[PDB]
Design a protein around this motif. Sequence first.
Motif, PDB file in Angstrom:
ATOM      1  N   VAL A  68      -5.338   3.259  25.787  1.00 30.18           N
ATOM      2  CA  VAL A  68      -5.049   4.509  27.388  1.00 30.18           C
ATOM      3  C   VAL A  68      -5.585   3.763  28.610  1.00 30.18           C
ATOM      4  O   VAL A  68      -5.258   2.802  29.054  1.00 30.18           O
ATOM      5  N   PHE A  70      -7.352   4.535  32.649  1.00 28.46           N
ATOM      6  CA  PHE A  70      -8.501   4.943  32.572  1.00 28.46           C
ATOM      7  C   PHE A  70      -9.199   5.039  33.856  1.00 28.46           C
ATOM      8  O   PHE A  70      -8.294   4.103  34.826  1.00 28.46           O
ATOM      9  N   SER A  71      -9.420   5.444  34.647  1.00 26.66           N
ATOM     10  CA  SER A  71     -10.161   5.306  35.510  1.00 26.66           C
ATOM     11  C   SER A  71     -10.754   4.272  36.296  1.00 26.66           C
ATOM     12  O   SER A  71     -11.645   3.690  35.443  1.00 26.66           O
ATOM     13  N   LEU A  94     -13.711   7.328  32.349  1.00 27.15           N
ATOM     14  CA  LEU A  94     -12.524   8.661  31.763  1.00 27.15           C
ATOM     15  C   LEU A  94     -11.327   8.353  31.697  1.00 27.15           C
ATOM     16  O   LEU A  94     -10.193   7.554  32.877  1.00 27.15           O
ATOM     17  N   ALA A  95     -10.778   8.026  30.280  1.00 19.85           N
ATOM     18  CA  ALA A  95      -9.153   8.689  30.157  1.00 19.85           C
ATOM     19  C   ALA A  95      -8.848   9.637  29.266  1.00 19.85           C
ATOM     20  O   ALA A  95     -10.094  10.843  28.722  1.00 19.85           O
ATOM     21  N   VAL A  96      -7.981  10.459  29.174  1.00 22.92           N
ATOM     22  CA  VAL A  96      -7.024  11.750  27.990  1.00 22.92           C
ATOM     23  C   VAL A  96      -7.589  10.699  26.202  1.00 22.92           C
ATOM     24  O   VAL A  96      -6.640   9.643  26.650  1.00 22.92           O
ATOM     25  N   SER A  99     -12.736  12.084  21.329  1.00 27.34           N
ATOM     26  CA  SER A  99     -13.953  11.176  21.357  1.00 27.34           C
ATOM     27  C   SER A  99     -14.693  12.695  21.000  1.00 27.34           C
ATOM     28  O   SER A  99     -15.005  13.590  21.364  1.00 27.34           O
ATOM     29  N   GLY A 121     -17.725  12.412  26.318  1.00 29.92           N
ATOM     30  CA  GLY A 121     -16.867  12.463  25.568  1.00 29.92           C
ATOM     31  C   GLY A 121     -16.648  14.614  25.923  1.00 29.92           C
ATOM     32  O   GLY A 121     -17.746  15.681  26.439  1.00 29.92           O
ATOM     33  N   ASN A 123     -13.611  18.356  26.294  1.00 27.92           N
ATOM     34  CA  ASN A 123     -11.857  18.784  26.895  1.00 27.92           C
ATOM     35  C   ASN A 123     -10.883  17.990  26.744  1.00 27.92           C
ATOM     36  O   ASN A 123     -10.003  17.956  27.557  1.00 27.92           O
ATOM     37  N   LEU A 125     -10.895  14.910  26.715  1.00 29.58           N
ATOM     38  CA  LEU A 125     -11.513  13.687  27.330  1.00 29.58           C
ATOM     39  C   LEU A 125     -12.587  12.378  26.936  1.00 29.58           C
ATOM     40  O   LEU A 125     -12.778  12.606  25.933  1.00 29.58           O
ATOM     41  N   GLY A 127     -14.756   9.281  27.467  1.00 29.32           N
ATOM     42  CA  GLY A 127     -15.641   8.331  28.634  1.00 29.32           C
ATOM     43  C   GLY A 127     -16.507   6.794  28.528  1.00 29.32           C
ATOM     44  O   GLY A 127     -16.491   6.764  27.404  1.00 29.32           O
TER      45      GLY A 127
END
Length: 139
Positions: A68, A70-71, A94-96, A99, A121, A123, A125, A127
């Motif tokens: 991933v 991630f931010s 966060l990452a796409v 989860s 997690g 949607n 995403l 975290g």
Amino acid sequence: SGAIYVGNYRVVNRHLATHNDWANLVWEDSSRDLLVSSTTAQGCDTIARCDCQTGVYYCSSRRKHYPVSFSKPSLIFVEASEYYPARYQSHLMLAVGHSEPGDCGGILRCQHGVVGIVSTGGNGLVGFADVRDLLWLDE
Ligand SMILES: NC(=O)[C@H]1CCN(C(=O)Cc2cc(C(F)(F)F)ccc2Cl)C1
Ligand SMILES: [Zn+2]
């Protein structure tokens, strides 16, 4: 579920900490969803000390690891659950990716070592609670 074992410490999601974790409490932060307890046996996980934004995490609901992007760790609004009211969680990345609640505790790793653990997690995403700033885990 899942934990990081480094030196004489065990790092777990605060909402999943056990009675033994709380009875051997070292540090906890509700705003980060982290708890650290002391252990008797020595841990050999390596903690990353970096600003990587790419890595691989373990997703128990798929029995697979996923790469991933991630931010950076930040203050993110996290919807209410059975463990916390709606609030801002700090040091969250966060990452796409996939989860489900039971995925909390899965490790995110970069080339330098452990970066954090799944904590949120939904949607599409995922975290991760960062642990790279906890310099004392190594001493
Ligand atoms: N860090 C937190 O506040 C944790 C506490 C427990 N948390 C959750 O269960 C949130 C969650 C919901 C979903 C969804 F959308 F399917 F329902 C998937 C994964 C997760 Cl981790 C957040
Ligand atoms: Zn790194």
